[PDB]
């Protein structure tokens with residue numbers, strides 16, 4: 001007999017703790033949350049590591065049906081895509097070597113900044129300093145961090161849980177996180193869909209069900225070791 005077909009879900013699995021590779025498998029908070037959500041939604045699915053810029057290209061062509069990849073909901077992105085209700089709150093931070101004199105975002109003036117291409121961190125860097133060669137763009141956040149380590153850049157702007165977990169997992173790298181609430185906005189992550197997707201409603205209801213049952217907090221505690229503040233998801 002005929003058919004799956006499965007929902008095709010894309011991701012950039014180079015963004016621990018949300019999605020990353022471990023032993024040939026894609027793991028992480030977004031991975032576990034997606035499984036809970038799609039199961040609650042009664043949707044069969046496949047999760048594919050397609051990379052960040054390809055993910056957006058493939059959503060536009062509808063080769064991929066859905067994405068989950070630590071993606072900030074933004075007004076500009078809503079022009080081209082649809083988002084689920086938010087499932088996480090985050091902010092950009094600055095990642096530097098210990099020893100850096102940087103105390104806030106404004107201290108990055110005249111310095112070289114590494115970011116992942118087409119991210120809200122690239123956006124924040126361009127908003128603060130204008131577009132130019134001092135902003136170095138990489139296809140993964142992993143490579144951005146590598147360019148911090150080897151001195152190719154002076155600082156990286158990326159998401160708080162990603163920077164924090166990198167430092168906590170890599171003490172011997174002697175990096176540090178600088179937070180700047182005055183210069184960086186609150187951000188909310190959403191699952192993402194091609195415009196006019198018939199999956200969004202099912203995913204929104206499933207996410208509600210996952211949060212309501214305590215499954216969201218079990219997953220959150222697995223990855224972060226503390227309770228979430230669920231009231232952040234109703235802002």
Ligand SMILES: N[C@@H](CCCC[NH3+])C(=O)O
Nearest residue numbers: 012015070071072119120
């Ligand atoms: N949350 C930021 C960074 C995500 C990058 C994930 N590879 C954004 O949506 O642009």
